[PDB]
């Protein structure tokens, strides 16, 4: 139940985006200039972080965020495009960096003069490196026919892309949307645009295996960063939690229960095998032997002893059981659902229903496990009593 309300991640590489967004760090807004080409095993995206400065949204959005969590950092490979014969700078009033500044690693391809023809440049790039390439591009919806005719000229606008696994076509709707793509090695990612195309400048490449965070607390590197949640870091050997069912990382199993206590000691009666409450009526305090014991009382040599021979074997059995169960699994959960920007309602209802049923079965497994292990410990300690008696 107890959590540390800081992102305590000493010893492994960490990036605090803050105002930066993780969908930002591909695009390069003014809030991600120092995190444009980051490289770490952690991403901390905050609630206040906006991924774009110009208004707009990502199409196929949560899946792209789930890819960029699993990146290990980004190695931006400089895509070799030049765009000869057209204007490149398209800085808008919405983004502020030393005045007018657009995205650093894309380009608003705009005509040289207003109300003029847009040459139909059909760009192409090949992934020479033996790694999948994250290719991004953006489409600027005009918002009106006047802005379309002023910027990209009159007439209908048709922009298409093309790959071996992606030949899906676009049209502007008379306010920039970005659309990602997986580019295989030895494959070509051919664009074809007639204006209203935020052309990319550099290609995104994954580095390793990062596991990201969505929270609001600050970063304070002092711990080992095993498991995380939306308000800090929870690190323990305990197999179950109660704080948040959306914990991402090497995280314990969420339960509906408040706190399930495993009876790691034996049945106690203060002042199920047979005679736990039999001729040996009640437990007696004057004995120091552990979670078992053989207290002594005499008539000529009165004093308390301890039968360490079976007791230490019993403690080794209980501690081996403890190290078996408190051993946490190696499974790595990911951040499927989002708490800052909500997912689509139907898929989110499926996700909540699946997650609630998973917590039902894990809570019932935890309750039944605690119950059977309590019965196992009591029956075991009664069995060492019985074998001592015989």
């Amino acid at each position, epitope marked *: 139940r107890t959590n540390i309300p800081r992102i305590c991640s000493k010893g492994k590489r960490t990036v605090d985006l803050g105002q930066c967004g993780l969908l930002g760090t591909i695009t390069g807004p003014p809030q991600c200039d120092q995190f444009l080409e980051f490289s770490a095993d952690l991403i901390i995206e905050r609630r206040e972080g906006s991924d774009v400065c110009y208004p707009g949204k990502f199409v196929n959005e949560e899946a792209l965020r789930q890819i960029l969590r699993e990146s290990g950092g980004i190695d931006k490979e400089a895509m070799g*495009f030049t765009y*000869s014969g057209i204007r490149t700078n398209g800085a808008t009033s919405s983004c502020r960096r030393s005045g007018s500044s657009f995205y650093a690693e894309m380009k608003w391809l705009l005509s040289n003069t207003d109300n003029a023809a847009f040459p139909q440049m059909t760009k192409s790039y090949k992934n020479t490196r033996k790694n999948p390439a994250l290719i991004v591009w953006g489409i600027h919806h005009s918002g009106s026919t006047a802005e379309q005719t002023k910027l990209y000229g009159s007439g209908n606008k048709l922009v298409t892309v093309g790959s071996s696994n992606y030949q899906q076509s676009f049209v502007p709707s008379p306010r920039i949307d970005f659309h990602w793509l997986m580019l295989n090695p030895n494959d070509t990612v051919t664009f074809s645009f007639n204006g209203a195309f935020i052309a990319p400048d550099r290609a995104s490449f994954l580095r390793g295996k990062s596991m990201g965070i969505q929270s609001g607390v600050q970063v304070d590197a002092d711990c080992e960063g095993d498991c995380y949640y939306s308000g800090g870091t929870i690190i323990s050997n305990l197999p179950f939690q109660n704080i948040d069912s959306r914990a991402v990382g090497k995280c314990p199993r969420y339960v509906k229960q408040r706190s399930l206590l495993l009876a790691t000691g034996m049945k106690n009666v203060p002042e199920l095998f047979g005679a736990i409450a039999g001729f040996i009526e009640n437990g007696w305090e004057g004995l120091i032997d552990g979670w078992y014991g053989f207290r002594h009382q005499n008539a000529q040599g009165e004093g308390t002893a301890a039968d360490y021979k079976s007791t230490q074997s019993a403690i080794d059995c209980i501690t081996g059981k403890l190290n078996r169960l408190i051993e946490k699994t190696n499974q790595q959960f990911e951040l499927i659902d989002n708490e800052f920007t909500e997912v689509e309602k139907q898929i989110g209802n499926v996700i909540n229903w699946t997650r609630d049923s998973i917590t039902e079965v894990w809570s019932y497994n935890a309750e039944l496990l605690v119950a059977m292990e309590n019965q196992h410990t009591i029956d075991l300690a009664d069995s060492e009593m019985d074998k001592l008696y015989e």
Partner: antibody
Amino acid sequence: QVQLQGSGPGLLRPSETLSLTCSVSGVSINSYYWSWVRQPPGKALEWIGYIYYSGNTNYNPSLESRVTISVDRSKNQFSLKMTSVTAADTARYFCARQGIFGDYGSDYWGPGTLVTVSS
Amino acid sequence: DIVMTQSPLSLPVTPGEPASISCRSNQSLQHSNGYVHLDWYRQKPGQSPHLLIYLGFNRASGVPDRFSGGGSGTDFTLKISRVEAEDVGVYYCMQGLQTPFTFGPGTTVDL
């Protein structure tokens, strides 16, 4: 819009190792991958081979053992070194980038570095 | 190695006339994207050449409208609407589908 510029020895005796250099602006050998070509005296233009900005090279099968291209990433120039120079290697080396590799912007052929074998 | 065949050899063209030069390959030129990898550079005698047509049959950036070489399959034909003073040039047909990037014998156009 990049600007290409070439330089190197002109009067060169045969058999020894040839030197060449070529300076570029703008792209700075940081994004697109360039290449070298060879034009024998008023003959058929040939393609020496391309070099990735990363460094991976791919020369023309016709001549491969006698040709090596310098990456030179830090400096804003890429050089060419040809071994076993011959009267056949007499040529007008051009330094450039091409359409078909992925950039669709002209070629920016650099100035001809005319070479001779003399004696 | 793809031998690129240029047709014809020379054009003693008269001023103001449509001039068309073709270039056939023994291998059909068609990139996976569907945009044929073929170019139409033109070398000014004793100087650095200039690309006139790119990606099979597409008007090149900063290139006069007269030049609009088309073609299909393995045989592509650069065409010019009129003949002018700057027209003089040894035209080369670049492929680009595979490596080697072969050119052409050239077309010595003149008045």
